[PDB]
Symmetry: C3
Subunit: 446 residues, 3 copies
C-alpha cells in the first residue's frame, strides 16, 4: 500500500514572486502538476497535498485530484509532513514524501524508489543524486562503509560537509507507521530554526532503524527549483525531454534546443518544425505539417499537410492543406476549412472560413460566416463593431470581395456575388449580383 | 586509382518517414549530397551509388553525377556493396565505401583516410572514432597489441563488447580486388539475418591480410544518422561549421548557435547577423548589410549596405542600401532598386521597384513595373487579379500614390502624376496629371 | 595610488573590419567600454587610453572620461605602454595595464588583482587563467617551484611551450616606477618584430625583481577577442551574465541562452520574458510585464502589467497595462497611454495616444495627437505627408474613426465625433458631429 505527501505550502522567498513557487510553470503546467503526474506512477491509495501560503490558488490547480491539509505557519518541511497526521496516522504502508519544486523527477524514478525501499526493507529511503555544484541542497552523509548516517542542510553544513557532492532530492519513502513517531522528535535547533524533514534520517538511526538511499540514473532529474535561475534550467531539461520524445516519434526539429512545445502538445509523424516555433496548451498538429520560425500556436488543432509560416494561431481549428502566413493572425473561435489560404497581414477573428477560400493580404475578417471558394482582395475590411454592439456578416460561396472594400455588418453577400474594389457595402448583395459603392475617377491635366 | 561506393538503398525504419533517409536535409541539402561532396575530395575515377528503396527519388538528386546500381532487396550493407560488382569487379585500386547517413565526415578526413590506407599498405582501412555513447554503432574490437580484429554490431555485441567506445563510422577503404572476393564469404548468421559489410574485416583476418584503422581528428564527424534525434545533432554540428566559417570570414553573429544559414549561402565581410536569422538556398548577402532577428531569406540576392529588419524575402533581388521592414514580405520575382525603402506590413510580389522608391506601410504591390522616386502612401492597394486573369500596372517616375488608394490594373500612372488619397483608379493617369476618385465629405452636426 | 593604462590602438587584422576592434559591441556597448567600466573598480587616480588606429572614433566613445595618448605606429603592446610615459613617468603607485579586447574581465577581478599585487609586494603581477585551448594566448612559463619566469607568445613558443594551458589575460599590475625603466630594455627580436609588453616579465627577472601571477576564479573572464568567433563567445558569456542577474532579480526567462538583453537594460521583478526577446539600449521594463517571442524594444520605457506580443518598439514610452501585438510597430517619439490597445499590423509613429484608446488592426497613426477612449476601426490610415511638408492631426476623446477611413492632415476630429467607415476626411469634424465621405452602394442584378 502506497501513500503520497506533496509539500506545497512554502513561501518560496528566493523566487521573489506573489505566485506560490510550486505554481510557476514549466512547459505549460505548474511544477506542482509535473510532480503530481510523477506521483501517480506509484498508484497511491491516498494522496495528500500540504498547502499553506496562498492555499486557495494551489487548491484550485489540483481540485478534486488530491486531499488537502493546511499548514497555517511555514515552520518547516518536517512540520508540513506533520499536518498529514489526521489523515495518515495509523495506516500501514510505504509513504512517499516529495517536494512540489522538483518538477524533473519522473514517475519511473519514483517507481524504482519504492521498489528499492520494499526490496531492501528500509524504514526510510532517500532519493539521491550527485552534482558538482551541490550548493543549497542537503548533503548525504555516509560512513566508511557507505551507510547513510544523516542529511545536513547547506546552512548547517561544515566546510567538510559542503564538499559532499551527493545531494538529497527532497524525495523519500518512509514506513508510514514509524514516520509519524519519528516526526515527534524533530527539534528547531538549526540555522533556520525550522522542523527539517531531513532530520528524521538521524532520528531513525538512534534506534538502529534501517535507512537507505536510491540513486537516480539521470542526475538531471534532481533539480530543486528555489529561484528563477533554477526554473530556467527546469524549462531547459523539460524542453529537451519533450522534444526528444517528438523526434523519436518521427518529428524533425531544425533546433530542438530552441523550440518551445508544451507538455501536452500532440504532434504527428513527418511534421517539420523549424527553430523558434512555439506550441502551447491543448495544441495538436497533423501529419506532414510544416511549421516555420516564429509560428506561435495556442490551444488549436491544425490538420495534415498544412503550412504555417511565421504566424500566430489561437483557440482555433485549421483543416488539412491550409496555408497561413507569413505574419498572419488567427484569433479565437475561428475555423479554417480545407485548403484555405490566409496570407500576410491578415487577421481572422471569430469566423468560419469555408474550403478553398483565399484572403492573401492586409485583410480583417471578424465575426463572419464565409463560404467556400471565396476570394478576399487585398485590403478588405469587415466591420462588426459600431461602438456598442457586435454584428454578423454572412458571405456565400464563390464570392469575389473586391480589394480595399469595406463590408459593414450586418450584411449578406449572396453566392457568386461580386463587390467592386474600393467599395463600401452597407446593404445586402443578392446572389449573382454586382455591388459597387465608390467615387468616379476624374483626371486633371497639368 | 580511387573508386567510391555510396550506400543509399536502405529503408531507414527508425526515421519513420516515406522519404528515403539519405534524402533528409541538413543545412539545405540532403545528407546524401553532403556525403557526395566529401567523396569528391579523393578524386575518384569511378563513383557508384547503391540505390533501392525509392531509387527514383535518390537518382533524381544525383542525376548525371554518379553511376547507379539497384539493390532490389535491402539484405544488408555487404549485399549493397555486392551490387557494385558488375562495374568495379576486376579493377585495380583503392575503393572507398561510405554510408549516405554520415553527413558530417569531411573530404579532408576522407583524403587522410586514403593516404593512411596507401601508406600502411592495408587491404582494408576502417575510419573510426571514439564516443561515450556508442549505442547503435559497430564496435571496433582490437587485441592486446591494438590490432584490429573485427567489427561487432550493437545487436550482436556482448556486454563486454558494448562497453567499447571506439566505433565504426561506416566509412572504409578496401583494396578493390580483394574486396569482392571477401564479400563472397559473408554469411547471414547474425541478429538481423543480413549481409554485414563490417564482416569483411574478420574475413580478411582469416587469410592474415593487413587491416588497419584511421582515427578521426574530430569525433563530431562520426555521427551516424539513423533517427530524427541524430538528424537534429547533424543540423547542430553542420550549423556550427557553416557559421564558424562565416565568422572567420569577417561576419558578426550575435548567436551562431541560433542562426540558420544553408550550406551554399554566400556572405560578404562586415555583415552583421542577429540571432534567429534564416538564410536558405542560393542566397547571397553583400558587404556591411545588417540582418535582424526573424529575417528569413530564400534564394535571393541582397546587396551591400542594406538593412533587412525582421522580414521575409523570396526569389528576389535587393540592391545596395535597401531598407526593409519590420514585417515586410518580398515575394518571388521581385526586384528592389538601390536605396528603396519598404516598411512594415508591405508586400511586394512579381514587381520591379526603381531606385529611391518608398512604400512604408500597409501596401500591396503586385505585378507592377514601378519607376524611381515613387511614393506609395500607407494603405495603397494594387489590384492585378479579377477572378480569371492577371493584369499589369505601370507606374512612372516621381509618382505620388495617395494613401488608401486602390489601383486597378491594367492602368498606367505617368511620370510625375499624383493619385489623391482614398481614390479608386480604373483608368490611365497621364504624366503630370492629378487623379481623384472618392466621395465628398459631409458633416452632420449634433 | 592606482593608475590605469588601456590599450586601444591596435589594427585588429583578424577582425577584418574598418571599425577598430575595441569598438565592436558586446551586449550593446563596445568591448572598450566594458573594459573601462571594470577599470573603474580600482578607483584609478589617472586613466590613460592608448589610441592610434582610427583614434578619432575611439576618442569619441570615451571622450571626457579618460586621458588619451597617440601611438602613431602599432609597433607593439610594449610600445603602446611607452606612449603613456609623458603622463605616468616618475609617479609612485600600482599601474594596471589592460587590453581593450578582453571585455569579460570584471571590476571585482581587477580589485582582487591589485590587492594580490600589493599584499605580495610584487614588482609585476600577471592576471592569468587556464584553458584547454590556449591557441593565440601568451603562455605562462614557470619553473619547478611554480615561480613565474616569463611569458612566451604563441608565434614564439616551442611545441613544449604551446602545450602550456596557463595563459596570459593581457592584464597586469606593474610598479609604476620600475615599469618605464624595464620598458627601455624591450627588443624587437621575435616572430612579429614588435615590442611585446609581455617581455617586461623576463626583463624584471634579470635583476631578481619579484614577479607573481594571480589566477582568475572564473576562467570565462579570460577571453581575448581577436576575431569574430571570439566576439560571439564574448556575446554568449556576457548574455549569460546579464540574464543571470535578471533571474536572480526575479525575472523569468523561458530560455536565458536565447534572449538578447543589453548591458544597461533595467527590468523589474515578476516580468516574464519568453525566448527570443530583444531589449536594447536605455530600455526599462515595469513589474509583471509580459514580453513574448520576437518582441524587440530599443531605447524605450514600458510600464507595469503591460503585454508586448511579438512587436517592435523604438524610442517610445508605453504606460501601465498597455497591450501590443502581435506584429505591431511603435516607431520613435510615440507615447501610449495607460491601457491602450494596439493590435496586429498597426504602426504608430511620432504620436501621443491617450488612455484606453484602441487601434486593433491594419492602421497607421502618424504625427497625431490622440485623446482617450478613441477607437480606430481596422484599416484606418492617417496622412501626414504630401510630398514636401508634414502636417499634424488632432483627434479628440471618445472619437470613433470608422474602418478603412483616410484622415488627411491637417485636420481635427472633435470630442465624441464619428467618422463613417470608408470615408476620406479632408476637413475638420466638429465635436459631436458625424462625417461621411464615401460613394453610395448600387447593386446590379444578374
Ligand atoms: C529541510 C529540507 O527539507 N531540505 C531539503 C529541501 O531544501 P529547500 O531549501 O529547497 O526547501 P524548500 O524551501 O524549497 O521546501 C521544500 C518543499 O517543502 C515546502 N515547504 C517548505 C517549508 C514549509 O514550512 N512548508 C512547506 O510545505 C516547499 O513548498 C517546497 O515544495 O529540498 C532540497 C531538494 O530540492 C533538499 O536538498 C533539502 O535537503
Ligand atoms: C552492418 C553495418 O554496416 N553497420 C554499420 C552501420 O550501422 P547502421 O545500423 O547505422 O546502418 P544503416 O541501416 O544506417 O545502413 C548504412 C548505410 O547502408 C545503407 N543500406 C543498408 C541496408 C541495405 O540493405 N542497403 C543499403 O544501401 C543505408 O541506406 C545507409 O546509407 O553504420 C554505422 C555508422 O553510422 C556503423 O557503426 C555500423 O558498424
Ligand atoms: C604581446 C602581447 O601583449 N600579447 C598578449 C595579447 O595578445 P594578442 O595577440 O591578443 O594582442 P592584440 O593584438 O589583441 O593587442 C592587445 C591589445 O593591445 C593593443 N595594441 C596592439 C598593438 C599595438 O601596437 N598597439 C596597441 O594598442 C590592441 O588594440 C589590443 O587592445 O593579449 C593576449 C590576451 O588577450 C595575451 O595572451 C598575449 O600574451
Ligand atoms: Mg526547494
Ligand atoms: Mg546508419
Ligand atoms: Mg588580443
Ligand atoms: Na484600405
Amino acid at each position: 500500500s502506497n501513500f503520497a505527501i506533496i509539500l506545497a505550502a512554502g513561501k518560496g522567498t528566493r523566487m521573489k514572486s506573489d505566485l506560490p513557487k510550486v505554481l510557476h510553470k514549466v512547459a505549460g503546467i505548474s511544477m506542482l502538476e509535473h510532480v503530481f503526474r510523477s506521483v501517480g506512477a506509484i498508484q497511491p491509495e491516498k494522496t495528500v497535498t500540504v498547502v499553506g501560503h496562498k492555499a486557495e490558488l494551489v487548491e484550485e490547480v489540483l481540485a478534486g485530484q488530491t486531499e488537502f491539509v493546511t499548514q497555517s505557519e511555514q515552520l518547516g518541511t518536517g512540520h508540513a509532513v506533520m499536518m498529514t497526521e489526521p489523515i495518515l496516522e495509523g495506516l500501514s504502508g510505504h509513504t512517499l514524501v516529495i517536494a512540489g519544486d522538483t518538477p524533473l523527477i519522473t514517475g519511473e524514478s519514483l517507481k524504482n524508489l519504492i521498489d528499492f525501499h520494499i526490496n531492501h526493507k528500509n524504514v526510510a529511503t532517500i532519493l539521491t543524486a550527485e552534482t558538482d555544484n551541490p550548493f543549497g541542497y542537503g548533503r548525504i552523509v555516509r560512513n566508511d562503509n557507505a551507510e547513510v548516517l544523516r542529511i545536513v542542510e547547506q546552512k548547517d553544513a561544515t566546510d567538510f560537509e559542503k564538499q559532499i557532492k551527493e545531494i538529497n532530492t527532497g524525495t523519500y519513502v518512509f514506513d508510514n507507521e514509524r514516520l509519524f513517531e519519528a516526526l515527534k522528535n524533530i527539534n528547531t535547533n538549526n540555522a533556520q530554526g525550522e522542523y527539517y524533514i531531513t532530520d528524521v534520517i538521524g532520528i531513525f538511526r538512534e534506534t538502529g532503524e534501517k535507512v537507505g538511499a536510491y540513486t537516480l540514473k539521470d542526475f538531471d532529474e534532481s533539480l530543486g527549483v528555489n529561484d528563477r535561475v533554477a526554473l530556467a534550467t527546469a524549462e531547459s531539461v523539460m524542453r529537451r525531454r519533450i522534444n526528444h520524445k517528438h523526434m523519436v516519434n518521427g518529428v524533425s526539429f531544425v533546433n530542438p534546443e530552441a523550440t518551445y512545445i508544451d507538455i501536452d502538445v500532440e504532434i504527428a509523424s513527418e511534421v517539420q518544425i523549424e527553430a523558434n516555433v512555439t506550441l502551447k496548451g491543448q495544441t495538436k498538429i497533423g501529419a506532414e505539417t510544416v511549421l516555420t520560425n516564429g509560428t506561435y500556436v495556442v490551444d488549436s488543432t491544425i490538420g495534415a499537410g498544412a503550412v504555417i509560416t511565421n504566424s500566430m494561431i489561437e483557440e482555433s481549428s485549421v483543416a488539412d492543406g491550409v496555408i497561413v502566413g507569413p505574419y498572419a493572425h488567427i484569433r479565437p473561435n475561428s475555423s479554417l476549412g480545407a485548403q484555405v489560404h490566409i496570407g500576410n497581414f491578415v487577421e481572422v477573428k471569430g469566423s468560419s472560413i469555408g474550403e478553398n477560400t483565399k484572403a492573401g493580404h492586409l485583410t480583417y475578417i471578424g465575426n463572419c460566416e464565409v463560404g467556400s471558394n471565396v476570394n478576399f482582395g487585398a485590403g478588405t475590411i469587415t466591420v462588426n463593431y459600431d461602438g456598442k454592439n457586435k454584428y454578423k456578416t454572412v458571405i456565400g460561396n464563390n464570392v469575389f470581395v473586391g480589394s480595399n472594400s469595406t463590408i459593414i455588418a450586418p450584411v449578406e453577400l449572396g453566392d457568386n456575388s461580386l463587390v467592386g474594389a474600393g467599395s463600401t457595402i452597407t446593404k445586402d448583395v443578392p446572389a449573382d449580383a454586382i455591388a459597387i459603392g465608390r467615387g468616379r475617377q476624374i483626371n486633371k491635366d497639368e
